[PDB]
Symmetry: C2
Subunit: 831 residues, 2 copies
């Protein structure tokens, strides 16, 4: 932690390259327009929302970047990847409009998008596919997202996939946002990887939403201390040029001690008052600091500005960041929240929430920033524009043209044509297996086929969060290598034999250690590379399913917003299947969390051939000609068993979510039996017992996706309600199933199979599931405890028949005794 | 970063207090019993699992703590709160068995708990309510949890609630685990709040599961750098006592330079070779270092120990942390993964996964730690014990008794009786409200009722994540104060006004800034204080609902395991209600995530009187004589509308999940209409349209909890299936509803209401919901887009009647036209 002053002294400050006066004229119009869009929205009295005080404090920082730093997407690369602070979007819009990229009609539709021609509250690529690129409004996600983006850019360079050396990743953050564990929790990775292509820009206005971040302390110093400790290059932009003379004429070093000893709380209060206040409460603290300005006017005291508001001080920091190599840079910019809004919110605790202001307030910002709007127009909350030929218009576009154009901007589809493998290339996985394998083995095998596709082999991005040994993928390190930039500065302990720990700068797999959020962020950068850099990359992130959506659900939702196209493989899944691990490992609900995401396609395959068909279909939809903006989630298991051959013509049903595996004959009745994942074979066992011991036949179905089926049914019923005069549309599951009493069982909570109830064409539909906290035991004991094994499926099936009077209820009661079922033990959900 | 040697020099290290030789005998027995436990489990070949190499590397660190530091639960306080590393549990189980707290049968039932006399794989209070305290296996949660538990202990002391000055929080972490963002993402708070009652003990064995944490670097220095930068007191326990002579005679400074330059990957390998290897590859790097051991035998060189393995160095560290005030301490203990296991795993990349070994491997461990079991008995894998009267038994118990007993241990219920507020105490919220308010305002008013309760007023712990102004709670800052251990070291900006930003050391409100996980960890510490310190505290953590389970779900699952008893308030909930915010804010699925947690009770109330009845019921269930182990989740809204008085006698129905609001007459037909949260008033609007425009009457229901009704339903059919000869149980929802066609509509995705399909006693049950990504617009436009407003309800109900021939389908067709519904607009889920 250094003295409370600028890191870069004037003597080391490079000459500012732009026309400061002209840039202010432009900047004042962007400020004005941003405020007008929020005020107009406010006028509607529709509770639309919006912010003003935030962009006010950071506008000049962005302005200096727009005029001299931000490279836009171009012929060679995707340009600089800017993670704009979410709520300062009105200013981004204000600027795109001045640039002629947005219409006045669109600005008038700020936060009203349902009818088209409107604008999102914040950066949402799903909502504005050709404008926004990175969803940053959920605080914490932007910083770590950016860390891994820069990391991925260096990965494409090392792998010789693309020259990304001219791209800089910028994360624009709030000081309050740095409280999120995700914001600072991964900064040492930027050091390990020497990400000299990443720049963190923290707007240190000392305030968050409720009040000051740490009024009793100094966040700038705390930030400096930890980032410096993590090996980052820290640049403090504390004071503007007006302070430079006052600092040079302080031989007592008392001024510096003052600044050092003053805490955040008193600092923002200073700028919420007036010159007189600062004079007594700040400079007045010492008869030495007091003197320095005894000659200055109270108005010349108030004029002193913070570094984050001085283009000259801002530029020096960004220029320095740009030159620094070997490590990442973090710029801590000192600013005023609600800057220039005077009365309205300048340095006030309520500043964040301000979205309206009387004509007195509007007039103030007009005078304050010398906005060119006459008293005759002002009450009309007019947008300002610069006509062709004007210096403002000329300068604004020239500066952007020298930097390759305008941003943000997004390309929804990649251009190249990939020659994806055919289903036939996964042929061996479609046939009966000699050895008993698991669906996780099937996935690794499918990965290897892909690794053999000339077209995409190098575009595959296997990602692990430690746990590769659990998946039996350790042999892969030697095969394709673990990515390590300037890696392997030692000889692996594993060296001698076969599966050693091979780390190479050209290594293909991303090993992110015990860090699911970081692994997901790596997966996200890869999964959106197709748009960001017009370079399709296909990520396969396999990890313990329990630590997926449950642990990184917020990033998974942002991923959907970002239109990620990739594969999330939830390994060691199923509540009863990862039997010995217990409560915090046994996943019987990940599919419930995943169905909440609109563009995530989830599957719970039972067999190897289903995995192959599913993964093949996914590559096609996402990276084939269709370029479908969706990502996949497949749960795989760690249990081995017999893998039969795929039934002829079963492909469509597998992709849709269900197909009839077989029909067992029986003379005493007929039931329908559904199963998914690892529980399917137990449902097939119940089918044999029922036919063998009770003469009850059945239709057996493998349900590869209860969720895709429920979605289909939902779509059918929705269309039906909307087209009352049309013949009702039949949900796919109802087209496949019949009306005989049905029973389903899975390794997930009951809701997973119960979600298709409305669409099941049977009078009876009994669902068995693994509701309840997990615990350690054998797979058999867990399957009995969670009441999902063959014996429970048999009793559920007999129970439905008994009801219809097809069998005696004493027969059900005897089966319960026969199968050693304790009809009175606590509901596993409460266990 | 300091030199790569011990922080505490020998001349500064205290004299070891215990009997070293006797302590090692006991430690050797514990080591052996931990391994016999896992080995015997592997022999079962049931894929039970377990680890050995991890506890082997950290055993001595825990030993010193059990012998001289760990304070057990006592009559004055809960003692030291130890977050034991999860997978070193066999070691904690081995000690407990030696202390006679566990039986041989229980150890033999390791990881087989479904039948009652087994042991959980890891620390799970829900599974072993009287043994385990904190769930740590989900890596990263232990560290943040521990930080916020230490902060909470200081809070209880400052608030004058309880003297916790004698309790120390210990966080036992792995080094690979430190990569989780949540592991280091909140460490500066320990500095902000001067948590000198927290000790982080990081086991640096240089390896995680797949291999070394950072083979090409030095995590101990990386850890040191960032923690030191965060303001923590860092203590490095690098080398054992055998190194002292060498470091002392090393006059050239060469040994330190060498130790400083060697990277993790090489140090790891050193431990996997032998003395000759070390002599050549380590000391042999420099003529000066080479001369230091030139007179040593390879055997003597091989005996050189790592600090984390030396009791004397370990003790010196914990003793120093003990006297460090003003900040938290991190102990970085250098160890060997697979320590003493030799061949099978010592310093090997495969060490983590080792679950079994050959007789030569068991005999090696027997020799390595001088275990008293004959070469003949080893085959039997015998458990070692200390007979009463023996030195070991006496010493073992004597050390614990001096420290108040044994740990871990847990008290399931609190002992005191609180005088909870009655429901009549909330009578004001039960009457019709004067002005239109929201359910959030109802919650704030309800909180104030409790705040006037003599008994619990000061036991309340309101927690916010920098969103108090949004929830209109900024007025409480002044009323009860914002907790601030260091008081207010400045004059707030709004000081001169009411609702000024008041910070106080006696402040009740926990302001955790933009930090959901930290706020949730504070919530958890408060919500389990009843068990930990036998001091029931009742936390109400309110935040934007979208950032609840989605963002901190892993914590919420652990909270259920930890038997948390408190309230989670999801503010600004509902997809269409937080209209202007958009994609990453509009929550229409948090209830789908919340329903996955077994002991979390979820509600989505529409009216203020419902909020009151639910909170009061929650209060009595968790903190009343019942002491039920569940926590509550209640979604509240930011929309103001008319709040009617509660219908006489509706209390129980509100608690259960559904009650009939009213029935409107109509002779052209009859339907049932269900609504929840904010959409309920639109469902009522539809009931009037249906009646006055179409003559269709209806039964209107307020569904306060679809999830509780589904669970009750599942419990009925489960019980029924199990008792085929008994009187079937009737789901609660089927006791309120009838069989007329039904329509449900909520601000959540369809599944939220569809989950009760099986138990709805009606032929037709159409569900409307907010499936799909949110977008920015007015409430009216969104409710129409998400097809959930009154007009959609009318069309859904009319269509049901037309289908049954009750009405002409042309009537439905006309309605769609009359209400300006686009029957062909894209499915909101795909939009
Ligand atoms: C309704 O909008 P809002 O509350 O103003 C908004 C934009 O949603 C924000 S902005 C915000 C405060 C940000 O303050 P910072 O100091 O980081 O940034 P600034 O001072 O405004 O430059 C919080 C807590 N939240 C709420 C918030 C909380 N938690 C997460 C994870 N994301 C959020 N974004
Ligand atoms: C099946 O057991 P497991 O895989 O051995 C276990 C216990 O589940 C662990 S342990 C582990 C490695 C821990 O290595 P550390 O260096 O932190 O600890 P140690 O070296 O063993 O002392 C990982 C990645 N996981 C998996 C893991 C990953 N991510 C989270 C969030 N929690 C986990 N617990
Ligand atoms: Mg701020
Ligand atoms: Mg380790």
């Amino acid at each position: 932690i250094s003295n409370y002053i600028n890191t870069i002294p004037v003597e080391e400050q490079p000459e500012y390259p732009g026309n400061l006066e002209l840039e202010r004229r432009i900047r004042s119009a962007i400020r004005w327009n941003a405020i007008m869009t929020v005020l107009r929205a406010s006028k509607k009295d529709l509770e639309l929302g919006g912010h003003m005080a935030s962009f006010q404090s950071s506008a000049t920082i962005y302005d200096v970047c727009f005029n001299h730093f931000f490279r836009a997407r171009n012929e060679q690369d995707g340009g600089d990847l800017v993670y704009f602070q979410g709520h300062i979007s009105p200013g981004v819009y204000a600027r795109a409009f001045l640039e002629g990229r947005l219409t006045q009609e669109q600005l008038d539709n700020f936060r009203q998008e349902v009818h088209g021609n409107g604008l999102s509250s914040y950066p949402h690529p799903k909502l504005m596919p050709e404008f926004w690129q990175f969803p940053t409004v959920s605080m914490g996600l932007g910083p770590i997202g950016a860390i891994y983006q820069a990391k991925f850019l260096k990965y494409l360079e090392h792998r010789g996939l693309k020259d990304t050396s001219k791209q800089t990743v910028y994360a624009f953050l709030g000081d309050g946002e740095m409280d999120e564990p995700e914001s600072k929790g991964a900064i040492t990775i930027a050091t390990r990887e020497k990400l000299d292509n990443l720049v963190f820009v923290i707007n240190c206005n000392l305030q968050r939403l409720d009040g000051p971040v740490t009024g009793n302390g100094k966040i700038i110093n705390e930030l400096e201390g930890i980032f410096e400790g993590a090996g980052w290059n820290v640049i403090k932009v504390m004071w503007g040029s007006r302070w430079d003379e006052l600092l040079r004429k302080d031989t007592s070093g008392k001024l510096i001690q003052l600044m050092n000893e003053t805490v955040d709380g008193d600092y923002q209060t200073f700028k919420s008052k007036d010159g007189a206040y600062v004079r007594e409460h700040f400079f007045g603290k010492y008869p030495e600091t007091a003197a320095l300005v005894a000659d200055w006017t109270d108005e010349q005291i108030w004029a002193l500005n913070r570094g984050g508001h001085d283009p000259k001080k801002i530029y020096a920091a960004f220029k320095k960041a740009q030159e620094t190599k070997g490590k990442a840079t973090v710029i801590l910019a000192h600013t005023i929240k609600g800057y220039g809004m005077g009365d309205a919110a300048e340095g006030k605790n309520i500043a964040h929430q301000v979205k309206k202001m009387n004509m007195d307030g509007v007039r103030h910002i007009r005078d304050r920033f010398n906005v060119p709007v006459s008293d005759a127009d002002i009450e009309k909350l007019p947008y300002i524009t610069f006509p062709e030929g004007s210096e403002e218009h000329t300068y604004l576009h020239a500066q952007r043209q020298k930097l390759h154009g305008y941003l943000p901007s997004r390309q929804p589809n990649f251009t190249e044509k990939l020659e994806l493998p055919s289903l036939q290339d996964f042929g061996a996985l479609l046939e009966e297996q000699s050895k008993e394998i698991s669906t996780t083995i099937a996935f690794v095998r499918a990965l290897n086929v892909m690794l053999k596709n000339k077209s995409i082999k190098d575009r595959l991005v296997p990602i692990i969060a430690d746990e590769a040994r659990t998946f039996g993928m350790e042999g892969l390190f030697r095969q394709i290598g673990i990515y390590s930039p300037n890696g392997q500065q030692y000889t692996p302990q594993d060296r001698e034999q076969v599966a050693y720990y091979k780390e190479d700068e050209k290594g293909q797999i991303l090993q992110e250690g015990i860090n699911e959020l970081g692994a997901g962020c790596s997966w996200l950068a890869a999964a959106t590379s197709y748009s960001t850099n017009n370079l399709p990359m296909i990520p396969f992130y396999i990890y313990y399913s329990m630590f997926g959506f449950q642990r990184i659900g917020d990033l998974c939702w942002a991923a959907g917003d970002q239109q990620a196209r990739g594969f999330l493989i939830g390994g060691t899944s199923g509540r009863t299947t990862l039997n010995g691990e217990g409560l915090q490992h046994e996943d019987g609900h990940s599919h419930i969390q995943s169905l909440t995401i609109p563009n995530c396609i989830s599957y719970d395959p039972a067999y190897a051939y289903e995995v192959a068909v599913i993964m093949h279909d996914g590559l096609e939809r996402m990276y084939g000609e269709k370029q479908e903006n969706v990502y996949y989630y497949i749960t795989t298991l760690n249990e081995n068993y017999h893998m039969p051959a795929m039934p002829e013509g079963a492909e469509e049903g597998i992709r849709k979510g269900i197909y009839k595996l077989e029909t067992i004959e029986g003379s005493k009745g007929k039931v329908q039996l559904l199963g998914s994942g690892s529980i399917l074979r137990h449902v097939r066992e119940a089918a044999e017992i029922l036919a063998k011991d009770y003469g009850v036949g059945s239709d057996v179905y493998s349900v590869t996706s209860f969720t895709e089926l429920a979605r289909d049914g939902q779509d059918c019923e929705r269309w039906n309600m909307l087209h009352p005069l049309e013949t009702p549309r039949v949900p796919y599951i109802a087209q496949v199933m019949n009306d005989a009493p049905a029973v389903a069982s899975t390794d997930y909570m009951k809701l997973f199979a119960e979600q298709v109830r409305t669409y099941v064409p049977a009078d009876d539909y009994r669902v068995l599931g693994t509701d309840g906290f997990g615990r350690s035991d054998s797979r058999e004991n867990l399957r009995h405890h969670f009441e999902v094994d063959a014996s429970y499926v048999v009793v559920a099936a007999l129970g439905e028949l008994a009801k219809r009077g097809e069998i005696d209820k004493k027969v059900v009661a005897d089966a319960i005794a026969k199968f050693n079922i304790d009809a009175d033990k606590v509901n596993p959900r409460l266990a």
